Amino acid sequence: QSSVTLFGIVDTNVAYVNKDAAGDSRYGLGTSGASTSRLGLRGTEDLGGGLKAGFWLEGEIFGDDGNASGFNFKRRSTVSLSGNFGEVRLGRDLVPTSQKLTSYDLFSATGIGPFMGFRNWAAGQGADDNGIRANNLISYYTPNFGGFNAGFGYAFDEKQTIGTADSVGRYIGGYVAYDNGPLSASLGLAQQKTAVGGLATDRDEITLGASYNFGVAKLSGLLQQTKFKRDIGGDIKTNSYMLGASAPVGGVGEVKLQYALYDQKAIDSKAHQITLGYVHNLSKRTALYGNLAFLKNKDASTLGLQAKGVYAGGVQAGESQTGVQVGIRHAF
Amino acid sequence: QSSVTLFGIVDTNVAYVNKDAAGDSRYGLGTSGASTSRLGLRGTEDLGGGLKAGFWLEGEIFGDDGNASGFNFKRRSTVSLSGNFGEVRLGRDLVPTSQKLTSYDLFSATGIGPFMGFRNWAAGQGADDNGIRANNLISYYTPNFGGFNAGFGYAFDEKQTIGTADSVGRYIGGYVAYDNGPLSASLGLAQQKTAVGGLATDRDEITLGASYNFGVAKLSGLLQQTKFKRDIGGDIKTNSYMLGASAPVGGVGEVKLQYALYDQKAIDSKAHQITLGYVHNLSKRTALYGNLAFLKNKDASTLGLQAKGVYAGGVQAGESQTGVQVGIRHAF
């Protein structure tokens, strides 16, 4: 039928990382360790005949400083029309490839140690070169057909020009997946137009994901290759691998263990990441959680843990980093 | 039980001050003369067994220019857990000392003439050197024990560094009080780490407050000493005194008279403040109000009245200032 919803999530924590780019430890009050804090309004209007209209406005919440930088709806601001033909969405939102593929990340793309494949590896100059969201986006999601489902999206560059790139921000991509019972598998392909050092560059991304729920435990993995290739030659390639396992502890408790490997070709360096986490649910809305992550940078790698609100910068080349995150996540 | 609330207050007025730092009079449409305008969302989830989870997001409203500078949740953005052990709060909020002690200000820390003890007397370089709120805050409030109640708070500096200060923003403090029937008394102590002129400085603040409701009238007072002491020597000290009386006028009317004295040692100057106000309630939600304030600066003192939205800057040394504020306050 028709309804309007005002909702959100406040997830704040105490965090700690043993070293920053200067070698000092850092600790304080951070946010979004289990789920990204947010505030949004959404609705669905039944137009009759299986046809529905909907809107969704969502922005991130920063409980540690009261959204000092302001509140906005950068997470999602869409209007849509859906029916048996599927669903068409207009407005900023996660692009189809990331919306579907981040579902295989047991840490939900947030907190100190989620899957970091979706990032701006080449220091591109586009606004969303981490391949997660896009402005001026138009999406189409098919209905489900015996497990099979797909999504396609296109984002207008609107002639944003940087250096020799005159179509910065353009996105073209989609995915094909099979979701049925305990099995889920997806293949996503996408290309964005951007600029690196003022030179036209294509950001090509292929991602394969799958997970299997065995009941007593769940297995999940991600395979991704992100290649920034400049028109004039020279490219930055990075392959990311991830395998994780999740298990319920009975009394609304959950344990998670995820391993990630980032093979950064451009600098011939690797980084190993291990995240262990526990989620204790006091209710369907409120949970207590703990995240323990370790990151080992090889050679020239300088990746760092994402302790949002405390420290999410890089570290000195070849340095290892350990981080802790303990907090409360409340949904409403 | 469990509930979610969307609320706020729109308080806008017409204001006038006979002189600014240039000696000219200033008048126009201002805000928050009786209560600070705000918009917020809050909720409480009964977890069973006396245990409750809650969230509170609140930001200030500026009706005169439609929040031209943007909307945020800088007033309060917390998530909390409470039970018979008391209450623990995480996120930006009033620090325990100001939350409790400003309750003795008959003008609720807003409008042209409230108690001005909570301010940045030394021109400190910290974000919240007026000792009112704090980022990265963790608070603990005890339950009430036969009138006795206390609150403690800690705010992480997160290594904010300015000059020789490498822990700017850190807060440590709390209060002990007795609240029963017509009597209320509190003692608050707090210390913040900051920087003045790029030099590490401690902002020490001790505040004593009490009020007695005699029914026909209410008596309230505040005693405070704020001392900014630099590590390398030299300090800025100011003692603030306040005594006020409030009285109901029967038909949902209220008269208020408050006197304040600010002894600014650093500049060996004093300032006398007298505020008279009337609040006429048309309902529990809507009220009409008028504020009349006079401020007399002695010698080098340059304090000015806070006519938010019109003029809240200082005045020429030794100058007296008179201000008027008339408006409507609507809560929802």
């Binding site: 309007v4 919803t5 409403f332 | -």
Partner: peptide, 8 residues
Amino acid sequence: DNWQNGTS
């Protein structure tokens, strides 16, 4: 329509 919360 009355505004509902994330769940109900």
